[PDB]
């Protein structure tokens with residue numbers, strides 16, 4: 001109450017410089033960028049693995065039957081099916097690992113929405129570097145971004 | 151009446167990095183198998199990328215726990231902190247390696263022909279932060295929590311006498327200041343004797359450090375199972391690739407060796423997919439240590455049964471091989 | 481097939497014997513690639529082909545004489561490239577992980593090291609660290625903040641006729657709080 | 669009178685479909701790092717090589 | 719004079735390549751534990767033999 005004008009102006013100037021910091025360089029949003037690049041690269045290696053021979057004569061399915069007879073094409077096509085079936089199990093397993101990483105961070109954001117936003121957390125170095133005052137949640141693509149006032 | 155007790159808790163922070171070679175494992179000491187493995191696709195690049203991501207995070211866990219202070223502090227030449235004996239935890243300059251008295255016990259209790267059997271491209275990379283600068287990070291947390299208190303975790307570090315900082319740890323529990331100043335004599339003797347009882351407790355048995363030993367035991371026996379997968383034949387007529395090509399024609403070895411390659415590639419995919427499970431548990435424990443080292447030692451915690459069994463006063467970290475060890479006073 | 485010493489055997493021809501040099505061997509039908517040192521294990525008279533835990537032969541008996549040798553693979557290690565950005569400079573530093581460079585700095589021969597850019601061994605001065613020596617950087621000793629990690633507390637940078645350097649990691653600026661027993665600082 | 673050899677070459681295509689730039693893996697460790705990241709610009713960092 | 723049976727044994731070799739010790743596998747449950755753990759000094763605890 002004895003320094004209301006200085007407090008209000010210093011918070012007002014602090015929010016001015018936060019626009020430039022998120023746009024100064026491309027490494028500010030690297031945490032959310034790593035989410036979308038991990039999924040886009042995982043899909044690309046799955047589609048590109050369709051063209052691998054896996055020890056068979058060719059990676060095209062129709063040309064095996066159109067040139068090679070049906071008496072022994074079963075062992076020729078089992079070498080290609082087992083390779084493609086293994087590639088799906090590799091993809092579906094790595095999504096299960098990554099979902100546990102997000103769930104350990106979707107519960108940290110669900111927690112920080114409760115102490116930092118709806119009160120003051122007395123846990124030191126949890127809602128900011130110093131003595132915590134408040135917080136403001138802001139949405140983001142596939143994530144959330146907090147603005148701790150400290 | 152009251153008693154002051156000292157309890158310890160042991161946590162892992164990181165494990166050993168590993169690098170695996172695409173071809174010296176599968177088609178080692180041969181060149182004709184290198185052409186056959188090329189047409190299988192990108193299994194080999196995915197293994198390298200996953201293992202490099204695991205090996206980067208081992209140096210992020212250590213920097214997250216220990217390296218949360220910017221300026222390295224140091225204790226004054228005098229060592230009279232109001233009547234307490236801190237010589238058991240502060241480093242001794244007389245040793246060639248600047249490490250403390252208790253930290254010398256922790257190194258000998260944990261034990262790390264380990265590479266002559268690893269001609270198959272199985273290599274352990276060294277950590278970025280060696281055991282010297284790790285021992286200098288944890289000698290700066292103790293030099294600021296003694297002189298400055300808890301104020302160096304929130305900006306500027308402010309000096310305070312230790313006989314007066316203890317009167318602020320009691321005030322955060324519920325008892326007033328006068329319980330310490332009127333009884334400064336016997337409280338000091340309980341603190342020194344409790345630390346000396348820790349020294350004999352660690353050297354009493356080797357089962358106290360089982361949480362850190364299982365970190366290196368699980369990794370060391372995981373590699374020994376991998377080097378004996380080569381003895382498995384997987385239905386081939388031999389387990390060595392220089393006997394298949396030297397005894398039968400090329401049109402028949404294309405199906406004999408394909409059974410070996412798709413089996414040895416499966417045995418390597420099972421190994422990496424178990425390391426992702428172990429890395430997700432260490433990170434779930436590195437974040438628990440980073441929480442305690444940011445809350446229990448940089449301040450006083452009001453969570454029941456989190457820091458110590460009872461009302462909590464402070465904590466003292468110690469550096470251990472592939473882990474951290476706390477000394478929660480109660 | 482081969483479990484015992486052979487007695488029949490096909491034609492072929494015999495060609496000398498070399499030691500401590502990476503060659504190709506066909507000792508009685510066993511092919512491979514490695515060096516042949518001198519061993520000290522005592523074979524039983526009915527045992528010739530030694531083995532190990534990984535079911536790979538590593539001890540053989542020269543068919544012609546009665547010498548006992550050992551088979552160990554040739555050198556092999558990783559390669560990393562320490563570079564600044566493309567639009568900053570173009571010089572690099574090849575790191576040879578996990579090797580003691582007393583024999584690999586020779587490098588140049590009639591097609592020995594498999595990479596083609598082996599000219600760096602005759603280039604800048606080498607420097608040995610705990611993770612294998614790097615070729616293409618010089619070791620200053622004053623401290624700097626870490627810019628690119630290498631291993632065992634060595635971090636390189638791009639110092640600015642400018643070449644990259646390697647130094648020792650600096651954890652931060654040393655501070656010393658003037659502790660006493662009657663001193664309190666309150667912020668204002 | 670030149671002479672050709674088997675090599676791996678990275679080629680960059682433009683919008684119309686004409687080759688505008690190329691590089692090879694087996695000349696320079698900088699070129700190898702360019703040739704293993706699928707880019708003509710590499711950011712400042714350590715990179716694994718064959 | 720004695721008669722042989724089809725069994726399984728665990729053999730330990732010294733540094734000279736000579737069989738200095740061996741353990742049966744179907745004699746008593748301790749031999750079964752040593753047989754299924756591929757060792758000789760089993761620790762205190764419950765185990766899970768065949």
Ligand SMILES: *[C@@H]1O[C@H](CO)[C@@H](O[C@@H]2O[C@H](CO)[C@@H](O)[C@H](O)[C@H]2NC(C)=O)[C@H](O)[C@H]1NC(C)=O
Nearest residue numbers: 151152153154335336337338339340341343344
């Ligand atoms: C409160 O408890 C302490 C801890 O036992 C007592 O201190 C002991 O007192 C006895 C006799 O007074 C001494 O023989 C011991 O050596 C003391 N312990 C230590 C560590 O010095 C203290 O006396 C108790 N206070 C009351 C009022 O009972």
Ligand SMILES: *[C@@H]1O[C@H](CO)[C@@H](O[C@@H]2O[C@H](CO)[C@@H](O)[C@H](O)[C@H]2NC(C)=O)[C@H](O)[C@H]1NC(C)=O
Nearest residue numbers: 228229230231232233234235236237238342346
């Ligand atoms: C705090 O206690 C330790 C307990 O070891 C003291 O170390 C002893 O110091 C005396 C005199 O300096 C020596 O005679 C002993 O040999 C030391 N103990 C050991 C195990 O070597 C230390 O001096 C005390 N410090 C203070 C400031 O009181």
Ligand SMILES: *[C@@H]1O[C@H](CO)[C@@H](O)[C@H](O)[C@H]1NC(C)=O
Nearest residue numbers: 564565566567568569711712
């Ligand atoms: C590339 O860009 C900046 C400015 O264009 C240049 O100064 C610098 O050398 C490079 N920056 C990097 C590699 O981060």
Ligand SMILES: *[C@@H]1O[C@H](CO)[C@@H](O)[C@H](O)[C@H]1NC(C)=O
Nearest residue numbers: 579580581582583608609610
């Ligand atoms: C490397 O080898 C040389 C001689 O072969 C030896 O003198 C030197 O000590 C070795 N390097 C290390 C780090 O031991």
Ligand SMILES: *[C@@H]1O[C@H](CO)[C@@H](O)[C@H](O)[C@H]1NC(C)=O
Nearest residue numbers: 618619620621622623647648
């Ligand atoms: C650092 O290296 C220079 C040049 O070799 C030398 O003059 C100086 O004494 C060295 N300093 C230390 C601390 O080693």
Ligand SMILES: *[C@@H]1O[C@H](CO)[C@@H](O)[C@H](O)[C@H]1NC(C)=O
Nearest residue numbers: 228229230232313660661662
């Ligand atoms: C403070 O310390 C000085 C020297 O360390 C000593 O002479 C003095 O008696 C101490 N005073 C108190 C009150 O502890």
